Design an enzyme around this catalytic site. Sequence first.
Site, mmCIF file in Angstrom:
data_model
loop_
_atom_site.group_PDB
_atom_site.id
_atom_site.type_symbol
_atom_site.label_atom_id
_atom_site.label_comp_id
_atom_site.label_asym_id
_atom_site.label_seq_id
_atom_site.Cartn_x
_atom_site.Cartn_y
_atom_site.Cartn_z
ATOM 1 N N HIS A 128 6.415 -21.553 67.528
ATOM 2 C CA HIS A 128 6.978 -20.874 66.160
ATOM 3 C C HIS A 128 6.750 -19.418 66.377
ATOM 4 O O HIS A 128 5.683 -18.973 66.436
ATOM 5 C CB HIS A 128 6.367 -21.543 65.062
ATOM 6 C CG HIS A 128 7.269 -21.416 63.941
ATOM 7 N ND1 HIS A 128 7.104 -20.639 62.911
ATOM 8 C CD2 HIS A 128 8.467 -22.173 63.649
ATOM 9 C CE1 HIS A 128 8.020 -20.865 62.017
ATOM 10 N NE2 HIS A 128 8.928 -21.666 62.460
ATOM 11 N N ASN A 137 12.846 -20.392 46.361
ATOM 12 C CA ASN A 137 12.962 -19.731 47.480
ATOM 13 C C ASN A 137 11.726 -20.080 48.614
ATOM 14 O O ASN A 137 10.563 -20.518 48.037
ATOM 15 C CB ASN A 137 13.321 -18.369 47.542
ATOM 16 C CG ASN A 137 12.051 -17.611 47.143
ATOM 17 O OD1 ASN A 137 11.070 -17.648 47.888
ATOM 18 N ND2 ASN A 137 12.158 -17.070 46.056
ATOM 19 N N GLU A 177 16.091 -33.079 61.721
ATOM 20 C CA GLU A 177 15.316 -33.537 60.591
ATOM 21 C C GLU A 177 16.003 -34.495 59.483
ATOM 22 O O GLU A 177 16.270 -33.973 58.754
ATOM 23 C CB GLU A 177 14.685 -32.415 59.728
ATOM 24 C CG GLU A 177 13.753 -31.437 60.606
ATOM 25 C CD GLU A 177 13.293 -30.270 60.109
ATOM 26 O OE1 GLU A 177 14.244 -29.402 59.609
ATOM 27 O OE2 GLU A 177 11.973 -29.998 59.974
ATOM 28 N N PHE A 194 9.853 -17.572 55.566
ATOM 29 C CA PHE A 194 10.148 -18.775 56.591
ATOM 30 C C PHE A 194 11.482 -18.577 57.208
ATOM 31 O O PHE A 194 11.564 -19.449 57.999
ATOM 32 C CB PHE A 194 9.671 -19.973 56.038
ATOM 33 C CG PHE A 194 8.314 -20.447 56.245
ATOM 34 C CD1 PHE A 194 7.219 -20.095 55.245
ATOM 35 C CD2 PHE A 194 7.996 -21.254 57.417
ATOM 36 C CE1 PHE A 194 6.137 -20.283 55.756
ATOM 37 C CE2 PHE A 194 6.779 -21.400 57.636
ATOM 38 C CZ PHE A 194 5.534 -20.770 56.724
ATOM 39 N N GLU A 235 21.508 -32.705 59.034
ATOM 40 C CA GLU A 235 20.048 -32.532 58.608
ATOM 41 C C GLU A 235 19.811 -32.736 57.068
ATOM 42 O O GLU A 235 20.722 -32.549 56.138
ATOM 43 C CB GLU A 235 19.689 -31.083 58.831
ATOM 44 C CG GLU A 235 18.136 -31.029 58.705
ATOM 45 C CD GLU A 235 17.420 -29.953 58.798
ATOM 46 O OE1 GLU A 235 17.853 -28.931 59.510
ATOM 47 O OE2 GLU A 235 16.437 -29.529 58.132
ATOM 48 N N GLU A 287 11.782 -27.900 70.036
ATOM 49 C CA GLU A 287 11.292 -26.676 69.502
ATOM 50 C C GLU A 287 9.858 -26.575 69.574
ATOM 51 O O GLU A 287 9.163 -27.546 69.357
ATOM 52 C CB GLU A 287 11.550 -26.880 68.063
ATOM 53 C CG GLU A 287 12.838 -26.920 67.355
ATOM 54 C CD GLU A 287 13.094 -27.327 65.768
ATOM 55 O OE1 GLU A 287 12.350 -26.552 65.016
ATOM 56 O OE2 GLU A 287 13.977 -28.237 65.547
ATOM 57 N N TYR A 288 9.389 -25.311 69.857
ATOM 58 C CA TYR A 288 7.980 -25.127 70.227
ATOM 59 C C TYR A 288 7.747 -23.678 70.109
ATOM 60 O O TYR A 288 8.589 -22.693 70.236
ATOM 61 C CB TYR A 288 7.502 -25.821 71.414
ATOM 62 C CG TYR A 288 7.776 -24.977 72.681
ATOM 63 C CD1 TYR A 288 9.074 -24.570 73.094
ATOM 64 C CD2 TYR A 288 6.944 -24.250 73.570
ATOM 65 C CE1 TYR A 288 9.514 -24.064 74.255
ATOM 66 C CE2 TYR A 288 6.941 -23.434 74.422
ATOM 67 C CZ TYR A 288 8.328 -23.513 74.869
ATOM 68 O OH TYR A 288 8.654 -22.728 76.046
ATOM 69 N N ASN A 348 11.632 -16.288 61.922
ATOM 70 C CA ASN A 348 11.095 -16.811 63.052
ATOM 71 C C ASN A 348 11.340 -16.408 64.406
ATOM 72 O O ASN A 348 11.156 -17.210 65.369
ATOM 73 C CB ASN A 348 10.965 -18.285 62.889
ATOM 74 C CG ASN A 348 10.946 -19.063 61.528
ATOM 75 O OD1 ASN A 348 11.352 -20.130 61.309
ATOM 76 N ND2 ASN A 348 10.263 -18.220 60.708
#
Lengths: 409, 204
Positions: free
Chosen positions: A335, A392, A256, A396, A211, A332-333, A399
């Site tokens: 969140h 930072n 990513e 986040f 990534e 990914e879905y 999740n």
Amino acid sequence: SGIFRDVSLLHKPTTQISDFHVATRFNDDFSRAVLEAEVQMCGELRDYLRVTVSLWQGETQVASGTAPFGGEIIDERGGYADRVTLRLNVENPKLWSAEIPNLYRAVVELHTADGTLIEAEACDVGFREVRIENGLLLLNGKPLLIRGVNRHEHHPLHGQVMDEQTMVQDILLMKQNNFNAVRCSHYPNHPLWYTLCDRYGLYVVDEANIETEGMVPMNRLTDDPRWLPAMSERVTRMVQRDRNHPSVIIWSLGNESGHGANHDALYRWIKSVDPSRPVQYEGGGADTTATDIICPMYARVDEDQPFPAVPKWSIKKWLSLPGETRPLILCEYAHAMGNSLGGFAKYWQAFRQYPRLQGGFVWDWVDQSLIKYDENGNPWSAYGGDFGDTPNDRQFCMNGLVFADRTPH
Amino acid sequence: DEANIETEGMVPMNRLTDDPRWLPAMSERVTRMVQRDRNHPSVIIWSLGNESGHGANHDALYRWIKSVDPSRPVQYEGGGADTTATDIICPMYARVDEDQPFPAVPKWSIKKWLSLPGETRPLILCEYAHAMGNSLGGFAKYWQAFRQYPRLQGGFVWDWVDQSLIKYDENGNPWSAYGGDFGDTPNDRQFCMNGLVFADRTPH
Ligand code: NA
Ligand code: NA
Ligand code: NA
Ligand code: NA
């Protein structure tokens, strides 16, 4: 950082088994199957050498084959004298799935013709066929509906060090909440994990450790031939390690990192090396030439997000885009950050109605919160910045559908 | 441009169109239309008829047009709107998001239809938005969808003008009449009035 995974000491004979690949191909109705085991050795080659692959169903021995080293002719220079492939027949095999994880035991024995064992290696085998046909991802001929989730290897007290107990726990919770698949976001997982998913029954997306979302543009490295080497090893070494696990049904090129040539090169490599599994990658727009599956991340059900270069089309509109024919499974879905998962029912409504909308992987399993202690010595969940870390990214890192201590949200 | 062929009254609907004995009669209603109108630029698509199931005859005639005139796509809604006798998925009254899973010939949500495994054709409803009386509700939903989906390329509303006939009462005054109003029987009530405008072209 540090040594976060087991350290071992392995002793192998000089003349040893250096590698073996297990494959299982079936007839159209899965009534017959042929187990193919390619075995490679090292050390002194001798005719008295033999390899015997035997397939075990419990205490029963369903099949067994023996042969001396010396592969088939592959090109003008001959073949691999240091290899041999065994092919065993299997009638009415017990197929493997997340529904019923039927496994067999394959035992590879390196020995001499006179019957002396030199060394033996083995693995669990799961007769299953994964193939994308006519726009659909088929597992043993039937079209799957991936009820999956992304899972980081995280422990509230041990950092990123995994242990059997934490693993089994997660797995039970997952299956208990009707999950059948997991994505190793975003790197190869601890070896034990695959073994568990094999036996407990979970479809796995094995993803290479790559990534570079921080670069600009995102594919600055992945498109640079100078970095093809470093990437290559993170893909190839994952495949050579986990390729025998039946729970692994799809290979992912990382996360990513835009879409560079390197991705295409490595995509094709896996396809050549292992035809048994589809390859996927969301970088560059989720439908690039480097993926067998349209695997967007956070693409909405009916609403389009027409971003330039890499838009996120309504998953329903995406399937029918001119020329498109692949199956669509979000990598990914939903969140699940905090009080989230609203509109989750809409995704499933759609998954069930559209044949080619075959599911996705929720993001994500557990909150990446760490435990700290106040003056009194009491524990509390901490996140971004709580360690003097800076810059930072606030909270986040939390999740999950469950708290760091596996308590459901 | 659509050939003069509808046998919706037969049972099953393709009892004639699948019977080789009727290939001749059908053939002429297709070929003679093509030979007549093939030069008009306004004609962009050829249709094999209406409501007549899906018989072999349809496939034979489909291929004929393709050989004779490559310039235009051929379409036919019979047999499920996506048969081997049509270049366009042309359903009639298939809803936007709701499926109508009828056996043999279901009407999938037009959005779901485009992505069915293997399917790749463009979808244009040959009939939609039955404008009978106080209707056309939910019309905006169709267009919302047409604009969002590249392959949802529109459709043909049903239909233009009310098929009402003028009669006169004792005083000699005119009034719009429909099914049965002529002693005709059996008749189908007012189902002949499905237009966006009245017989006299007055907008609805
Ligand atoms: Na589906
Ligand atoms: Na995160
Ligand atoms: Na459109
Ligand atoms: Na009518």
